[PDB]
From Swiss-Prot, chain A:
It is found in: Cytoplasm; Nucleus. Component of the anaphase promoting complex/cyclosome (APC/C), a cell cycle-regulated E3 ubiquitin-protein ligase complex that controls progression through mitosis and the G1 phase of the cell cycle. The APC/C is thought to confer substrate specificity and, in the presence of ubiquitin-conjugating E2 enzymes, it catalyzes the formation of protein-ubiquitin conjugates that are subsequently degraded by the 26S proteasome. The chain holds residues 5 to 50 of 250 of the full protein. This is Anaphase-promoting complex subunit DOC1. Belongs to the APC10 family.
Swiss-Prot record, chain B:
Belongs to the APC1 family. The lineage of its organism: Eukaryota, Fungi, Dikarya, Ascomycota, Saccharomycotina. It comes from the Eukaryota. This is Anaphase-promoting complex subunit 1. It comes from Saccharomyces cerevisiae (strain ATCC 204508 / S288c) (Baker's yeast). Present with 178 molecules/cell in log phase SD medium. The APC/C is composed of at least 13 subunits that stay tightly associated throughout the cell cycle: APC1, APC2, APC4, APC5, APC9, APC11, CDC16, CDC23, CDC26, CDC27, DOC1, MND2 and SWM1. APC1 interacts directly with MND2. The chain holds residues 1333 to 1499 of 1748 of the full protein. It is found in: Nucleus; Cytoplasm; Cytoplasm, Cytoskeleton, Spindle pole. Component of the anaphase promoting complex/cyclosome (APC/C), a cell cycle-regulated E3 ubiquitin-protein ligase complex that controls progression through mitosis and the G1 phase of the cell cycle. The APC/C is thought to confer substrate specificity and, in the presence of ubiquitin-conjugating E2 enzymes, it catalyzes the formation of protein-ubiquitin conjugates that are subsequently degraded by the 26S proteasome.
Swiss-Prot record, chain C:
The gene is APC2. This is Anaphase-promoting complex subunit 2. The APC/C is composed of at least 13 subunits that stay tightly associated throughout the cell cycle: APC1, APC2, APC4, APC5, APC9, APC11, CDC16, CDC23, CDC26, CDC27, DOC1, MND2 and SWM1. APC2 interacts directly with APC11 thereby anchoring APC11 to the core complex. Component of the anaphase promoting complex/cyclosome (APC/C), a cell cycle-regulated E3 ubiquitin-protein ligase complex that controls progression through mitosis and the G1 phase of the cell cycle. The APC/C is thought to confer substrate specificity and, in the presence of ubiquitin-conjugating E2 enzymes, it catalyzes the formation of protein-ubiquitin conjugates that are subsequently degraded by the 26S proteasome. The chain holds residues 367 to 488 of 853 of the full protein. It is found in: Cytoplasm; Nucleus. Belongs to the cullin family. Present with 432 molecules/cell in log phase SD medium.
Length: 46, 117, 78
């Protein structure tokens, strides 16, 4: 039990898939000339 | 972190075997997760920053209990924490980029002071 | 300890570079007035020419295997 909760706390081999993150900071588009379902969720006034 | 730090300071320089073995098991378990930005998520990133703090504490505490002995496995663990920067680079708006690099370089500085101690 | 005895002898420099470059005995015999043992020349030549003197998972394994596996007057000594 002690070992298993440590493994749940610290999953060594379970988590790391490939370690291949691109690391660039993601950019959000705020323009209001294109109509899309995702933009409508974040942009309210129409 | 708090429990092991009190534990390490309590058995300071007196040396022991069970405490050393427990910390060896703990550091072996906690070492692979260290400085792994796999899925760049703020919740995950904060938790693994706490992991970096926790692994810094375990190495320092393990060194504290086994001070002045020149042990092998403690040296083995502290050598590994010392070498290999890891992090986002390698393998495992200008001021804004400056702050982004500053956060990572400060993380490396914090990781280095612990292993040097 | 031994070099001053080498500088004492005069013809050492010429014969040794000629040994270095493995020059033929005919060129040696043209301007050197003392006999040189051909067997010694071939033996030193033989000694001179004697020359007996999947990528991200290996980093986790080789970071662990190479950094946690404790293996328990100038240099001029090449």
């Amino acid at each position: 039990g002690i070992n298993k909760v440590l493994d749940h706390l610290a999953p060594s081999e379970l988590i790391k898939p490939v370690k291949s993150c691109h690391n660039k900071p993601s950019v959000l588009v705020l323009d209001d000339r294109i109509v899309d379902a995702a933009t409508k969720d974040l942009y309210v006034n129409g | 972190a708090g429990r092991i730090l009190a534990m390490g300071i309590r058995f300071a320089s007196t040396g022991n075997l069970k405490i050393r073995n427990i910390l060896l098991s703990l550091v072996d378990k906690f070492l692979p997760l260290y400085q792994y930005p796999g899925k760049q998520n703020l919740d995950f990133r904060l938790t693994i920053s706490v992991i970096n703090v926790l692994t810094n504490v375990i190495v320092v505490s393990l060194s504290m209990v086994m001070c002045a002995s020149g042990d092998l496995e403690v040296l083995r663990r502290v050598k590994y924490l010392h070498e290999v920067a890891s992090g986002p680079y390698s393998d495992l708006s200008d001021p804004t980029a400056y702050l982004e690099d500053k956060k990572d370089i400060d993380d490396h500085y914090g990781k280095f002071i612990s292993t040097n101690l | 300890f031994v070099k001053p005895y080498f500088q004492e002898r005069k013809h050492l420099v010429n014969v040794l570079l000629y040994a270095m470059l493995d020059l033929p005995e005919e060129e040696l015999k043209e301007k050197i007035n003392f006999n040189v043992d051909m067997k010694a020349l071939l033996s030193l030549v033989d000694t001179l020419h004697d020359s007996d003197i999947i990528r991200h998972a290996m980093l986790y394994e080789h970071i662990l295997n190479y950094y946690i596996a404790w293996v328990p007057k100038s240099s001029y000594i090449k």
